[PDB]
C-alpha cells in the first residue's frame, strides 16, 4: 500500500521528510470530532502543510441546565501517543499532554477497590475471580482461532454458550466495554486479541489510565490551541450535505463539498490537490437532553452525519454501508446516559463506604465503573477524579451513570429508563447504593442535579458488521478522499476507542501525502509467547498446567508426554517464568 | 530491581521527572569510550545532572602515517536511538544524529551485490542459499532451546557438528560477526535470538545500516559537542590505577580513585553521592601500529584498562573475572586489521568489477564485508561510502581488511599475517581480488598506503565465559558504583555492539539515580510468532511445511494430523501469511 507498519524506537523518534508537493495542497476536515483534530494535527507536524490551508468544517458555532460527563486510555495506544508527545499541555509549562498525563497516572495510579456491587449496596462475593469454566475458556480460544472472514454478521450469542455468559468475565467484559449479546462477534474477537496483555488487570482496572479533567479539557482543548497556534481555519455552522465524487474505472476524485453555511447554500470546489477527510458516521448524533424534572426525549432521527455517509454510499459500495450501524438497533439497547452532580454529604458518604475512597479528594474515587450486577437496567456508574471540570466548586462530585437495558422496569422506579427523568434515574441509582428508602426521593429531587441524555446511536460502533460495511481509510484508487473515525476500516485495531480515531487519522494523512515514516502497528501482544502464557494462567484463575488438566485423562496423558520433551530446556524455564509449571 | 523494562511508544516519548537529590550529586566516568559518552549524555538529559559535575577521565590528551578505519547498526538498537534522537547532528541543521542517519539510509539503502568471492576473484557459486542440512537446522534449534545456564564455558565446537560448519550460513555468520570455533556458545546463542528478525537479510546485508563518515565523526564527535555544550568536564592524560571500594556485608561504596594525572600521583575521594561509571575492560587496549613497510609489532601487554579491572576483581568476585577474556587467547585468533588507501584507478577498477558498484561514487560500494572464502587467512574486506573521512581527497578509497586466522601462511605471501607489513597484506588481498600477478607487488608497494594494526584483545568479547565472569551493571547492594561496556552483564542483549555500550550506559544511569522511566527491552522477536515462522521458512531456503518433511515418514505423519486440527482457522491463515503452507 501507500504505507508500511512498523514497531520500533527507530521509527518512533525519527522525523519524516517534508512530503513532495505539499506546498501546493489544501485539506478539508469534516466535523470537529477528535479524529479530525488529530488528522489536522498530523497534517501540521508530519505533513508540514500550511496552517492557512487546513479547513475544519463543523455544524456547531461558539442551553444546558447542568453538568454532563462524556472511556479510559491504556499505555499501548501507540498512535495516540505519537500525537500528544507533540501537543503542548495547558497546565504544566513546557511539557506535552503526554508528559502531564504520564506523570499524573504515575503519581496517582488507577485501581478499583470495589468493582461489582449487588443486593442494594453490598460488595459481590466472588469479585476478583473470573468464574470461567472449562467450556467457557474454550469458546474464547475458538473465537480467536476463528478467522475474521468467518464472522460476517455473526452475533456474540452465536460464538458463546451459557457457561461463558453466567460468569464474572462476561460481567467484567460487557460493562467496561458496553458490549451487548446481539453485538458483533467480529469486534469482540478483536477486543480479546487487542487487550490480551492487560487481561490480569481486567478485574481491577489496574491497566486503565484517566486524564485530569474531562475529555474536552484534557484532550480536545490542548489540540485546538495547537491547531490555532499554527493558523488552522475553523469554519463554524457549516453543515455538509453531499460530496460529489468522480468514481471512474481508474480513479476516485472528490469534486464538490455541498454545504449549508448557517443558512446560505454554498459549495467548495476541489482539485486533485484538495484533500478531504470525512469522519463518516457518529455515535453522538441526534442526542436529546433532559433535566432533573423531565426525561430526555427519545428520538430516532438521521443526523447530518449519517445522511452524509448515506449520500456517499449511493456513490460507491467501496465507501461503506451505513445502514448496518444506524438502522435496526434493538430497542433494548443502550441509549440513556446520566450525570448526577451533588454536594450533599450523605450521598458522598454513601459512595465512600462502597468505593473505599474519599470522593471529595482530587484522587481516584471508584477507579473505573462500578457495576450493579443484579440491577434491572444492568446499570453501571463511575466517579472520576473530582473535580472533573476546571471551574466546578471544590465540594461537588459528578457521577456518570449508564445502563445496558432500556426497555425493562427498574427495581425501584418500576419503569424503563427511557421514561425516567434525572431524579428518577438518581432515585434508582441511590436505591442500589444502599441509601435508605426514607431518604431516596428527597436526596434525588433536591440534593442531586441529575441530567439524562438520550443518544439513539451510542451502540452503532459494535453493530454486527460484515467485510465491506466499514469503508477503508483510503479506498482503492482514491486520490484525494479519506474516511476517518471509528466507522472506517483498518487492521486489527478496535473501535469505540480514542486510539482508533487517531489511528485512522494518522493513516489518512500518511497515505494521501506519502510520508516517509512508518505507522506504529497494533501492539503484537496476541503473537507474543510471553503474553499468551500469561493469558492462559490468568484465564484459569491462576492455575498451573498441572491443575488445568487434573480431571481429564485424555489431556493429562498428552501433557505428561509434552513435559518429557521440553524438560530442562528454554521452554520449561519459560513456563515457570510465567507461572505455568 | 531499581528498574523496569518496557516496550511501547508510551514509555519512549515520555520525559522522566528530575530524579530526587540529583542537585547534590557528581559522577565520574572512566575512559572516553563510546559507552561512557552515552552514560554522561544520559546523566545530562534524563538525570538532569549539572554539566560542571560530570567528569570524564581519559588516558589520551589532544604519530600515525596513514588512514585507519575502525560495525554496522540495525533498526532495533532500541537504546542507541533513544540517545541520538536527542543529539544534534554536525551536518544538517536542526536535525538530530538519528534524523540524518534515518534519512541517509533511506535515500541510499544498503545491500551487498557480491557477498562471497573465491578462486582469486570469482563470485561464489552458491552465494545466496544457506546450504543448511536437516541436521544443521536442528543444532540451531537445540542451542536456542538450551537454557543459558547450561552453557558455562561451552565453546561453539561443542554445540554444532560438521553439517553446520561446512555451510554458507556458518560462512555468513563467522565473518560478519567475527566468531571463532573456540568462542562462546553462550554468546552465539544470544546472537541467534537477538537478530532472528533480520535472518532473511543475513545473506545480503539488507538489514545493515551505516553512518556517513567514520565512527568518530558520525557518532563520537556529535556526542562530544553535546557534552561540552552542557559543560561536561573532560580530564585528559588521567590513568586510573585502582578504585578503593568498601564491600561491607550491607553495602558497596566507592571511596578513592587512584589516578596518575600525566606524571603526578593524585587521588579523588568519593562520598556516597559521587557516582562512578567504570568501563571495565577494552578490546582496543595495547594496540600496536605498523606501516606500508613494517609489520605492526605483536604484543601481549596488560593495559591500564585490564589492570584496572584486575584491581577490582581482587576486591570482590561480584565485580567480575577479567582473566577469562584477556588470558589464554588462542594464537590463531584475530589480531591484525588493515586499511589500504589508494587512488590508483586499476585497483578501484578491479573492486568495481567485483562489488558491481563504483567505489569512487559517494554511495554504497561493497554493501558490507566481502569474504574471500578459500583464503588461507580467512580474510574479509569491506569498502564503505567513500570518502569515509571528512577531509580526504575525493579520488581515494579506504579499504578495511581483517582475517580470522593469524598463524597460517597466506596463499601468495607464504607467511602468517602477524609477520606481514602493509604492502604484504595489500599484496595478499590484491591476489585474491584477481589482480594480475605481474601488477601485484607494484600496485601494493607504490600505489596503496596500507596500515596494519595489531590489537591483542579484539576477540576478548566473545571468549568462552561463565555466569559470573561479567559483572552486573549495578552489583547487588551497590550504592555509587556501576560497570558499563561490553564486559558488563545484562539480559539477552549482545556484546561487540554499539547497542550494548548504550544499553549498559542507560541502565547504569537509570538505576543509580532511580529515574521514573522504563528502559527499552531487547526486541521481542525471539518470542514473536510471526518472526519465528519467518525464521523456519528462511532457514530452510524458502520451503513450505510440506517440502520440509517430504522424506520423513515419522514427520510427514505428524504434520498431516496437525493440518487436520488447524484447518480453516487463524493458525492456517497465519501459515500461508508467512509462506509456510
Short mmCIF file of N, CA, C and O in Angstrom, two decimals, chain B residues 1-67:
data_model
loop_
_atom_site.label_atom_id
_atom_site.label_comp_id
_atom_site.label_asym_id
_atom_site.label_seq_id
_atom_site.Cartn_x
_atom_site.Cartn_y
_atom_site.Cartn_z
N UNK B 1 14.12 -4.99 40.67
CA UNK B 1 15.35 -4.21 40.72
C UNK B 1 15.03 -2.72 40.80
O UNK B 1 13.88 -2.32 40.93
N UNK B 2 16.08 -1.89 40.70
CA UNK B 2 15.93 -0.44 40.67
C UNK B 2 15.48 0.06 39.31
O UNK B 2 15.89 1.14 38.86
N UNK B 3 14.61 -0.69 38.63
CA UNK B 3 14.49 -0.61 37.18
C UNK B 3 13.20 -1.29 36.76
O UNK B 3 12.56 -2.00 37.54
N UNK B 4 12.82 -1.06 35.50
CA UNK B 4 11.83 -1.92 34.86
C UNK B 4 11.99 -1.79 33.36
O UNK B 4 12.21 -0.69 32.84
N UNK B 5 11.90 -2.92 32.66
CA UNK B 5 11.94 -2.90 31.21
C UNK B 5 10.55 -2.59 30.67
O UNK B 5 9.54 -2.89 31.29
N UNK B 6 10.52 -1.97 29.49
CA UNK B 6 9.27 -1.60 28.85
C UNK B 6 9.41 -1.74 27.35
O UNK B 6 10.52 -1.87 26.82
N UNK B 7 8.27 -1.71 26.65
CA UNK B 7 8.27 -1.94 25.21
C UNK B 7 7.10 -1.24 24.51
O UNK B 7 6.24 -1.88 23.89
N UNK B 8 7.07 0.09 24.56
CA UNK B 8 5.95 0.81 23.97
C UNK B 8 6.35 2.18 23.47
O UNK B 8 7.50 2.62 23.63
N UNK B 9 5.39 2.85 22.83
CA UNK B 9 5.58 4.25 22.48
C UNK B 9 5.26 5.15 23.65
O UNK B 9 5.82 6.25 23.76
N UNK B 10 4.35 4.71 24.53
CA UNK B 10 4.08 5.40 25.78
C UNK B 10 5.36 5.69 26.55
O UNK B 10 5.65 6.84 26.91
N UNK B 11 6.15 4.65 26.80
CA UNK B 11 7.37 4.80 27.58
C UNK B 11 8.45 5.56 26.82
O UNK B 11 9.29 6.22 27.43
N UNK B 12 8.42 5.49 25.48
CA UNK B 12 9.50 6.03 24.67
C UNK B 12 9.46 7.55 24.60
O UNK B 12 10.47 8.22 24.88
N UNK B 13 8.32 8.12 24.22
CA UNK B 13 8.24 9.56 24.04
C UNK B 13 8.24 10.32 25.36
O UNK B 13 8.59 11.51 25.38
N UNK B 14 7.86 9.67 26.46
CA UNK B 14 7.66 10.38 27.72
C UNK B 14 8.99 10.83 28.32
O UNK B 14 10.04 10.20 28.13
N UNK B 15 8.94 11.96 29.06
CA UNK B 15 10.09 12.51 29.78
C UNK B 15 9.99 12.15 31.25
O UNK B 15 8.94 12.38 31.87
N UNK B 16 11.05 11.61 31.84
CA UNK B 16 11.00 11.27 33.27
C UNK B 16 11.31 12.47 34.15
O UNK B 16 12.07 13.37 33.78
N UNK B 17 10.70 12.47 35.33
CA UNK B 17 10.89 13.55 36.28
C UNK B 17 12.36 13.65 36.69
O UNK B 17 13.15 12.73 36.50
N UNK B 18 12.71 14.80 37.25
CA UNK B 18 14.07 15.03 37.70
C UNK B 18 14.34 14.16 38.93
O UNK B 18 13.65 14.32 39.94
N UNK B 19 15.30 13.25 38.87
CA UNK B 19 15.50 12.31 39.98
C UNK B 19 15.82 13.03 41.28
O UNK B 19 16.47 14.08 41.28
N UNK B 20 15.34 12.46 42.38
CA UNK B 20 15.49 13.11 43.67
C UNK B 20 16.95 13.20 44.08
O UNK B 20 17.74 12.28 43.85
N UNK B 21 17.31 14.35 44.66
CA UNK B 21 18.63 14.60 45.25
C UNK B 21 19.74 14.68 44.22
O UNK B 21 20.92 14.60 44.58
N UNK B 22 19.41 14.85 42.94
CA UNK B 22 20.47 14.96 41.93
C UNK B 22 21.15 16.32 41.98
O UNK B 22 22.25 16.48 41.44
N UNK B 23 20.53 17.32 42.63
CA UNK B 23 21.14 18.64 42.71
C UNK B 23 22.37 18.66 43.62
O UNK B 23 23.03 19.71 43.70
N UNK B 24 22.71 17.55 44.28
CA UNK B 24 23.87 17.47 45.15
C UNK B 24 24.79 16.31 44.76
O UNK B 24 25.52 15.79 45.60
N UNK B 25 24.76 15.88 43.50
CA UNK B 25 25.49 14.70 43.09
C UNK B 25 26.51 15.00 42.00
O UNK B 25 26.34 15.92 41.19
N UNK B 26 27.57 14.20 42.00
CA UNK B 26 28.61 14.24 40.99
C UNK B 26 28.80 12.84 40.44
O UNK B 26 28.53 11.84 41.12
N UNK B 27 29.28 12.76 39.20
CA UNK B 27 29.53 11.49 38.54
C UNK B 27 30.88 11.52 37.84
O UNK B 27 31.25 12.53 37.23
N UNK B 28 31.60 10.42 37.93
CA UNK B 28 32.90 10.27 37.30
C UNK B 28 32.81 9.12 36.30
O UNK B 28 32.24 8.07 36.61
N UNK B 29 33.35 9.33 35.11
CA UNK B 29 33.24 8.36 34.03
C UNK B 29 34.63 7.93 33.58
O UNK B 29 35.48 8.78 33.26
N UNK B 30 34.85 6.62 33.55
CA UNK B 30 36.18 6.04 33.37
C UNK B 30 36.37 5.73 31.89
O UNK B 30 35.69 4.86 31.34
N UNK B 31 37.28 6.44 31.25
CA UNK B 31 37.55 6.23 29.83
C UNK B 31 36.67 7.08 28.95
O UNK B 31 35.55 7.46 29.31
N UNK B 32 37.19 7.40 27.76
CA UNK B 32 36.45 8.17 26.77
C UNK B 32 35.74 7.29 25.76
O UNK B 32 35.35 7.77 24.69
N UNK B 33 35.56 6.01 26.07
CA UNK B 33 34.87 5.11 25.16
C UNK B 33 33.44 5.54 24.89
O UNK B 33 32.88 6.42 25.54
N UNK B 34 32.85 4.88 23.89
CA UNK B 34 31.51 5.26 23.45
C UNK B 34 30.46 5.00 24.52
O UNK B 34 29.44 5.69 24.57
N UNK B 35 30.69 4.02 25.40
CA UNK B 35 29.73 3.75 26.47
C UNK B 35 29.72 4.87 27.50
O UNK B 35 28.64 5.31 27.93
N UNK B 36 30.90 5.35 27.91
CA UNK B 36 30.97 6.46 28.85
C UNK B 36 30.30 7.70 28.28
O UNK B 36 29.49 8.36 28.95
N UNK B 37 30.61 8.04 27.02
CA UNK B 37 30.00 9.18 26.36
C UNK B 37 28.48 9.10 26.39
O UNK B 37 27.80 10.12 26.52
N UNK B 38 27.93 7.88 26.29
CA UNK B 38 26.48 7.71 26.37
C UNK B 38 25.98 7.83 27.80
O UNK B 38 24.93 8.45 28.04
N UNK B 39 26.70 7.25 28.76
CA UNK B 39 26.30 7.38 30.16
C UNK B 39 26.30 8.83 30.61
O UNK B 39 25.38 9.27 31.31
N UNK B 40 27.31 9.60 30.20
CA UNK B 40 27.34 11.02 30.52
C UNK B 40 26.19 11.76 29.85
O UNK B 40 25.58 12.64 30.46
N UNK B 41 25.89 11.42 28.60
CA UNK B 41 24.77 12.04 27.91
C UNK B 41 23.45 11.73 28.61
O UNK B 41 22.57 12.59 28.69
N UNK B 42 23.31 10.51 29.12
CA UNK B 42 22.09 10.15 29.83
C UNK B 42 22.00 10.88 31.17
O UNK B 42 20.90 11.18 31.64
N UNK B 43 23.14 11.16 31.80
CA UNK B 43 23.15 11.95 33.02
C UNK B 43 22.72 13.39 32.76
O UNK B 43 22.15 14.04 33.65
N UNK B 44 22.99 13.91 31.57
CA UNK B 44 22.62 15.29 31.24
C UNK B 44 21.12 15.39 30.98
O UNK B 44 20.42 16.20 31.60
N UNK B 45 20.62 14.56 30.07
CA UNK B 45 19.23 14.69 29.61
C UNK B 45 18.26 14.17 30.66
O UNK B 45 17.42 14.92 31.17
N UNK B 46 18.33 12.87 30.97
CA UNK B 46 17.31 12.27 31.81
C UNK B 46 17.59 12.49 33.29
O UNK B 46 16.66 12.75 34.07
N UNK B 47 18.85 12.38 33.71
CA UNK B 47 19.18 12.61 35.10
C UNK B 47 19.18 14.07 35.51
O UNK B 47 19.22 14.35 36.71
N UNK B 48 19.14 14.99 34.54
CA UNK B 48 19.14 16.43 34.80
C UNK B 48 20.29 16.84 35.72
O UNK B 48 20.17 17.77 36.52
N UNK B 49 21.42 16.16 35.60
CA UNK B 49 22.58 16.50 36.41
C UNK B 49 23.27 17.73 35.85
O UNK B 49 23.10 18.11 34.69
N UNK B 50 24.06 18.38 36.70
CA UNK B 50 24.84 19.53 36.27
C UNK B 50 25.93 19.10 35.30
O UNK B 50 26.49 18.01 35.39
N UNK B 51 26.24 19.99 34.35
CA UNK B 51 27.35 19.75 33.45
C UNK B 51 28.70 19.93 34.11
O UNK B 51 29.65 19.20 33.81
N UNK B 52 28.81 20.89 35.04
CA UNK B 52 30.04 21.13 35.79
C UNK B 52 30.39 20.00 36.75
O UNK B 52 31.44 20.06 37.39
N UNK B 53 29.55 18.96 36.87
CA UNK B 53 29.77 17.88 37.83
C UNK B 53 29.94 16.52 37.17
O UNK B 53 30.00 15.51 37.87
N UNK B 54 30.01 16.46 35.84
CA UNK B 54 30.29 15.22 35.12
C UNK B 54 31.75 15.25 34.68
O UNK B 54 32.14 16.10 33.87
N UNK B 55 32.54 14.33 35.20
CA UNK B 55 33.96 14.24 34.90
C UNK B 55 34.22 13.00 34.07
O UNK B 55 33.80 11.90 34.44
N UNK B 56 34.90 13.17 32.94
CA UNK B 56 35.30 12.08 32.06
C UNK B 56 36.81 11.99 32.10
O UNK B 56 37.51 12.84 31.54
N UNK B 57 37.33 10.96 32.76
CA UNK B 57 38.77 10.73 32.84
C UNK B 57 39.22 9.87 31.66
O UNK B 57 38.63 8.81 31.41
N UNK B 58 40.25 10.32 30.96
CA UNK B 58 40.79 9.60 29.82
C UNK B 58 42.31 9.61 29.90
O UNK B 58 42.91 10.54 30.46
N UNK B 59 42.93 8.57 29.35
CA UNK B 59 44.39 8.48 29.30
C UNK B 59 44.99 9.34 28.20
O UNK B 59 46.17 9.70 28.30
N UNK B 60 44.23 9.66 27.18
CA UNK B 60 44.62 10.40 25.99
C UNK B 60 44.47 11.90 26.20
O UNK B 60 43.58 12.34 26.94
N UNK B 61 45.33 12.72 25.58
CA UNK B 61 45.18 14.17 25.69
C UNK B 61 44.49 14.80 24.49
O UNK B 61 43.27 14.67 24.32
N UNK B 62 45.26 15.47 23.64
CA UNK B 62 44.71 16.13 22.46
C UNK B 62 44.69 15.18 21.26
O UNK B 62 45.45 14.22 21.20
N UNK B 63 53.63 9.78 15.40
CA UNK B 63 52.21 9.96 15.07
C UNK B 63 51.62 8.73 14.38
O UNK B 63 51.86 7.60 14.81
N UNK B 64 50.84 8.95 13.32
CA UNK B 64 50.29 7.89 12.50
C UNK B 64 50.48 8.25 11.04
O UNK B 64 50.12 9.36 10.62
N UNK B 65 51.03 7.32 10.26
CA UNK B 65 51.43 7.59 8.88
C UNK B 65 50.44 7.00 7.89
O UNK B 65 50.81 6.28 6.96
N UNK B 66 49.16 7.30 8.07
CA UNK B 66 48.14 6.81 7.16
C UNK B 66 46.77 6.86 7.80
O UNK B 66 46.60 7.30 8.93
N UNK B 67 45.80 6.40 7.02
CA UNK B 67 44.41 6.35 7.46
C UNK B 67 44.13 5.00 8.11
O UNK B 67 44.68 3.97 7.71
#
